[PDB]
Structure 1
Amino acid sequence: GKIIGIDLGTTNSCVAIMDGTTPRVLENAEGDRTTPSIIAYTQDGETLVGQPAKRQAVTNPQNTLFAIKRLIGRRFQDEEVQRDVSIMPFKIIAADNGDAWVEVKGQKMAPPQISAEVLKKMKKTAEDYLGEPVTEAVITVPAYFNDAQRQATKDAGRIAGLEVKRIINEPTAAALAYGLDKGTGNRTIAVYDLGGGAFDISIIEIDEVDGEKTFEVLATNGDTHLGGEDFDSRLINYLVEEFKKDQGIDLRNDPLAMQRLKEAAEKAKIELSSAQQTDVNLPYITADATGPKHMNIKVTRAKLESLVEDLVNRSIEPLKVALQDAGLSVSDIDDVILVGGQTRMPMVQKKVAEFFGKEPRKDVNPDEAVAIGAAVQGGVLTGDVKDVLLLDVTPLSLGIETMGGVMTTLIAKNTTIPTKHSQVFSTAEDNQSAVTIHVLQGERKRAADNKSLGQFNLDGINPAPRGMPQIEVTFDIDADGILHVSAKDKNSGKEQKITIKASSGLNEDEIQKMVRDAEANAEADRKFEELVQTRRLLLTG
């Protein structure tokens, strides 16, 4: 019946539910509206997840798993994983198919089984609160996720025993919370998503027409080098040099010290959004030949702002990129929303306040906003929320190059994504051995008039006197907005395919110039295609 929304965070998870008209964030078993995303394997053969798993990490670096959201769906030879292999204290291994897996206590295990454990805790958190079993779910993912990662997010839920009703991306989920507030229609909003694992900026339009509120993403892009875990690194490296300057010991090579130090580094970081000072007292952190060593160093707040200013500045070019892709001016941008626990630090809000010239909205809970919005999607699916429409549509038509230099339209503008449709084409020459599929986007009928987005060949077409082999062309734009083009020659069984990425933005000012141009040029476009018909649509070499 009801469909729950889950914030799958790198660092914390959060559960919320629609209680009629107003959303409620549900507490986990400790009473916390957020649960750390950490998994631990104890000597006694049981697996800890959440706040219990976080606590035993300092003595169990190999069998305490955290930051598993950085491992799901990727190949081992990726640079950051090699970057990740060196810094992480637990064991990273390759799966038989080349996937990135982990191995704990001699058991080779994939991340989705591990992440499924948190959902079961979230599931049990929901089951204890509701007193009944729960099985239908909408799950969130980052906006920069590719084709392989989202499907893997669906599968992980199934290993946790869930039917995944919807995948939605995380910057979109947090915004649903904001739109419950009054006065949110007909505005342009920016979703700046800075988590533990990455930077994300999304541009979203909130429109309301004829009693229906519609939401459309105008731009998105991401940068995985600007996430909250990269900030913690910017402290682990420095802290060793101050002790080394005073007493000559390099801690980078001591994981047990590194395990307490990250915990000391992580918990204190929360404090500096509210606080101005504190003293780190971690007795017996290590020792050398002359006996025990003790940490006691006083340090305030300014130095950190000096240390991480470049990360904020390197996130700006992705912000600058987002506005061009959406085609908007600052004067079209109506509101600022903070999501994520790290925005409670004052300089980021000021750096944002200087940039936007207005204070970010203070009514969005940074630890809970993502979870609250995902719960709304469940109410839409059950009918609990009325007069709301998820808008995800194509700005321009998509197609392939055909006979005579003609574009044949396969997908008309403003069709909802995901989508798939089929059409039959044939061969142009006797005994034709090859075809070129030139993937094209635009509103003009001449193929030579569109932008090259890529092109591909399909071979193995059986020889025939022209037009007999039957080559079926499929374009698939999946729920991530990514276009999958596939081809199978039905008489032989062969299959080849390509993938075409989702756009980072939708530039309507330039698009609207092209559309008005197209209305003015309608008659010029017909005669060319009809005289190509004059000279089943055909594909060139």
Structure 2
Amino acid sequence: SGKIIGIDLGTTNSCVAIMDGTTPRVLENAEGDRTTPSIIAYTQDGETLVGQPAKRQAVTNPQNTLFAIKRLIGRRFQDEEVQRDVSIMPFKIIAADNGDAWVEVKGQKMAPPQISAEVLKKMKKTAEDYLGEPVTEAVITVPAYFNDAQRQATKDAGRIAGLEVKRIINEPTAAALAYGLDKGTGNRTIAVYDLGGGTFDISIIEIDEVDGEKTFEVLATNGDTHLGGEDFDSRLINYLVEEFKKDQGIDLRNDPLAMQRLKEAAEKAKIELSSAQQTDVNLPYITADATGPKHMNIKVTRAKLESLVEDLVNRSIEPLKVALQDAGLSVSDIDDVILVGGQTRMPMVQKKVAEFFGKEPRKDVNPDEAVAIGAAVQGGVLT
């Protein structure tokens, strides 16, 4: 029946949503999850894995497990983001013959859109599995700061995935549509605070009712492309390494398998601490030595997590001030504050944002779902 999907093609994760009549519905993937890791593995035996199945095999296949491709897409190999990433990514980043930032996978040169297209194919299949019918139309989101090359390379990923890309929309504009900030009257200035797995974006968006149609303008954009939830995980991981050093003599940083388990356990404990006051990190058989297997069992309070990440939360505030100054505005000129991204579910982040703007952020949608939902709302406007 010709159905247009909304896709959040995120740095860390991806989300796919749809109009179910008048109501947006985020879809569950083949693994039962409403979010799919933006991770693509080319296995030794010839399979292409995407999402949590690729995440599981990553430490067995570091060369051919790709992730963070949103950092490369539409960029040149000499871009400062790309040069920073060359020495930290375990997969091989290369210059194309035209100077573009490409990847080499099992000896094959590939452009970033060919890799991101595997994420988009999974979002497409995820929609087809829920609907019981083909899906070939999409709205896809990008950061507001993306230039024509990054937008066009994102379009190219959709085309390679077999999607007719009806429209590339800004992420904070999609978030405004999901929060229903179009079902209003007059002028409306909004702050979109977006804290994902890898990036922090602040966008100030003006929204005028004029001539019966609603205008949308990005007045200012700021942030930090190296501030996200993975950095919050890293603070908890480093705490868990040092407590296990103190209590059992072992530096777990030597054991790269123990470290894959510890990262996973730190993220789970962080996420539990958004709704509980304390949790346990319990990893049986975490490592072993001459005296046999060791077991990690460490209580983590929410207050301990908050102390480990406070300066990361405080880094998000200076780009808010600069964004307001570039827009020519004060906190009182902001009518609505919306949160986007899974890391904004943390009570400390919500409270710091509410405190800075002097108003409680809206609650209409999940922060981690807003970009995909708004892409779907925009798709339904074109249906």
Scaled by the length of structure 1, the TM-score of the pair is 0.65
Aligned to 2:185: 184
Shift of 1:202: 0.6
Q: Deviations over 1:416-469 (max 9, x none)?
A: xxxxxxxxxxxxxxxxxxxxxxxxxxxxxxxxxxxxxxxxxxxxxxxxxxxxxx
CA contact (8 A) 1:336 1:361 kept: yes
Q: Which runs of 5+ in 1 are unaligned?
A: 383-541
Q: Deviations over 1:70-91 (max 9, x none)?
A: 3323344555555544544445
Aligned to 2:166: 165
Shift of 1:189: 0.9
Q: Deviations over 1:379-430 (max 9, x none)?
A: 3333xxxxxxxxxxxxxxxxxxxxxxxxxxxxxxxxxxxxxxxxxxxxxxxx
Shift of 1:153: 0.7
- Which whole-Å CA distance do the structure 2 matches of 1:280 and 1:188 have between them? 43
CA contact (8 A) 2:228 2:343 kept: no
CA contact (8 A) 1:61 1:259 kept: no
- Which whole-Å CA distance do the structure 2 matches of 1:237 and 1:74 have between them? 32
- Which whole-Å CA distance do the structure 1 matches of 2:28 and 2:185 have between them? 28
Shift of 1:372: 0.9
Aligned to 1:201: 202
Would the alpha carbon gap of residues 284 and 148 (structure 1) be closer, same or farther in structure 2, given more than 3 Å must change? Answer: same
Would the alpha carbon gap of residues 90 and 264 (structure 1) be closer, same or farther in structure 2, given more than 3 Å must change? Answer: farther
- Which whole-Å CA distance do the structure 1 matches of 2:343 and 2:234 have between them? 15
Aligned to 1:297: 298
- Which whole-Å CA distance do the structure 2 matches of 1:172 and 1:312 have between them? 24
Q: Deviations over 1:42-95 (max 9, x none)?
A: 343212112322333354444433333233233445555555445444454554
Q: Which 10-residue stretch deviates more, 369-378 or 28-37? A: 28-37
Secondary structure, aligned partner of 1:187 = strand
CA contact (8 A) 1:61 1:90 kept: yes
CA contact (8 A) 2:197 2:342 kept: no
CA contact (8 A) 2:206 2:216 kept: yes
Secondary structure, aligned partner of 2:30 = coil
Would the alpha carbon gap of residues 257 and 230 (structure 1) be closer, same or farther in structure 2, given more than 3 Å must change? Answer: same
Shift of 1:248: 3.6
- Which whole-Å CA distance do the structure 1 matches of 2:302 and 2:268 have between them? 15
Would the alpha carbon gap of residues 134 and 348 (structure 1) be closer, same or farther in structure 2, given more than 3 Å must change? Answer: same
Aligned to 1:385: none
- Which whole-Å CA distance do the structure 1 matches of 2:268 and 2:90 have between them? 19
Shift of 1:229: 2.5
CA contact (8 A) 1:76 1:94 kept: yes
Would the alpha carbon gap of residues 100 and 202 (structure 1) be closer, same or farther in structure 2, given more than 3 Å must change? Answer: same
CA contact (8 A) 1:232 1:266 kept: yes
- Which whole-Å CA distance do the structure 1 matches of 2:373 and 2:328 have between them? 30
Secondary structure, aligned partner of 1:103 = strand
Q: Deviations over 1:300-330 (max 9, x none)?
A: 2223222222222222121001112212233
Shift of 1:97: 4.7
Would the alpha carbon gap of residues 89 and 229 (structure 1) be closer, same or farther in structure 2, given more than 3 Å must change? Answer: same
The structure showing larger relative contact order (alpha-carbon pairs under 8 Å, at least 6 residues apart) is 2
Shift of 1:370: 0.7
Identity of aligned residues (%): 100
Q: Which 10-residue stretch deviates more, 292-301 or 336-345? A: 292-301
Would the alpha carbon gap of residues 167 and 182 (structure 1) be closer, same or farther in structure 2, given more than 3 Å must change? Answer: closer
CA contact (8 A) 1:339 1:364 kept: no
Shift of 1:7: 0.7
- Which whole-Å CA distance do the structure 1 matches of 2:287 and 2:84 have between them? 26
Would the alpha carbon gap of residues 232 and 178 (structure 1) be closer, same or farther in structure 2, given more than 3 Å must change? Answer: same
Shift of 1:274: 0.7
Secondary structure, aligned partner of 1:278 = strand
Would the alpha carbon gap of residues 210 and 99 (structure 1) be closer, same or farther in structure 2, given more than 3 Å must change? Answer: closer
Q: Deviations over 1:102-130 (max 9, x none)?
A: 44444443332221112111111222333
- Which whole-Å CA distance do the structure 2 matches of 1:291 and 1:96 have between them? 53
Q: Which 10-residue stretch deviates more, 171-180 or 127-136? A: 127-136
Write out aligned runs for 1:466-505 (5 A): none
Q: Which 10-residue stretch deviates more, 4-13 or 31-40? A: 31-40
CA contact (8 A) 1:89 1:255 kept: no
- Which whole-Å CA distance do the structure 2 matches of 1:92 and 1:285 have between them? 32
Would the alpha carbon gap of residues 164 and 6 (structure 1) be closer, same or farther in structure 2, given more than 3 Å must change? Answer: same
Would the alpha carbon gap of residues 205 and 82 (structure 1) be closer, same or farther in structure 2, given more than 3 Å must change? Answer: closer
CA contact (8 A) 2:92 2:105 kept: yes
Secondary structure, aligned partner of 1:313 = helix
Scaled by the length of structure 2, the TM-score of the pair is 0.89
Q: Deviations over 1:243-282 (max 9, x none)?
A: 2333443333443222222111222221111112222222
Matched, 1:233 2:234: yes
Would the alpha carbon gap of residues 101 and 260 (structure 1) be closer, same or farther in structure 2, given more than 3 Å must change? Answer: farther
Secondary structure, aligned partner of 2:368 = coil
CA contact (8 A) 1:337 1:364 kept: no
CA contact (8 A) 1:102 1:111 kept: yes
CA contact (8 A) 1:61 1:255 kept: no
CA contact (8 A) 2:59 2:257 kept: yes
Aligned to 2:47: 46
CA contact (8 A) 1:188 1:335 kept: yes
- Which whole-Å CA distance do the structure 2 matches of 1:31 and 1:232 have between them? 23
Q: Which 10-residue stretch deviates more, 16-25 or 315-324? A: 16-25
Q: Which 10-residue stretch deviates more, 310-319 or 129-138? A: 129-138
Aligned to 1:24: 25
CA contact (8 A) 1:144 1:200 kept: no
- Which whole-Å CA distance do the structure 2 matches of 1:307 and 1:131 have between them? 46
Shift of 1:196: 1.7
Aligned to 1:135: 136
CA contact (8 A) 1:140 1:167 kept: yes
Secondary structure, aligned partner of 2:382 = helix
Secondary structure, aligned partner of 1:108 = strand
Would the alpha carbon gap of residues 235 and 13 (structure 1) be closer, same or farther in structure 2, given more than 3 Å must change? Answer: same
Aligned to 1:476: none
CA contact (8 A) 1:36 1:50 kept: yes
